[PDB]
Amino acid sequence: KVFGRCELAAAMKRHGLDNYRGYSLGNWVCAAKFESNFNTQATNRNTDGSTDYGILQINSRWWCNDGRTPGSRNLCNIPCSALLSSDITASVNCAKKIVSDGNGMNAWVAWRNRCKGTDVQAWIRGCRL
Ligand code: NA
Numbered sequence: 001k002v003f004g005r006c007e008l009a010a011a012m013k014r015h016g017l018d019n020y021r022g023y024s025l026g027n028w029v030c031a032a033k034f035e036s037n038f039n040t041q042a043t044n045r046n047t048d049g050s051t052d053y054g055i056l057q058i059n060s061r062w063w064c065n066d067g068r069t070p071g072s073r074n075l076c077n078i079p080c081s082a083l084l085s086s087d088i089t090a091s092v093n094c095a096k097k098i099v100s101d102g103n104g105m106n107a108w109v110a111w112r113n114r115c116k117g118t119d120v121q122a123w124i125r126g127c128r129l
Pocket residue numbers: 060061062063064065066067069072073074
């Protein structure tokens with residue numbers, strides 16, 4: 001599924017991501033934009049041989065099991081394929097664990113490099129929320 005901007009903002013809010021660990025909804029939409037271009041089926045291989053999955057590019061190195069990431073953990077206790085669903089419940093549940101891990105949204109290098117400190121409210125501008 002390729003979400004629309006205000007459609008994803010609505011889905012995230014409904015699953016309790018807005019102001020989770022103090023991160024406004026525009027932070028989460030901005031992260032999704034640059035991680036996946038709002039595509040639930042996005043996958044990308046890391047140099048280390050782990051893979052990032054879904055709207056928030058959650059990494060098999062720590063958070064999900066893909067069966068091909070030697071020495072990795074599965075701290076969200078999900079198959080990585082669950083993170084490619086059109087329903088973002090699994091991605092949001094797992095993202096709550098990630099942003100709680102100590103470094104907040106810095107876990108998402110594209111959030112740090114492209115969203116952090118920017119006018120993230122622009123991402124939910126005009127959305128009926
Ligand atoms: Na893993």
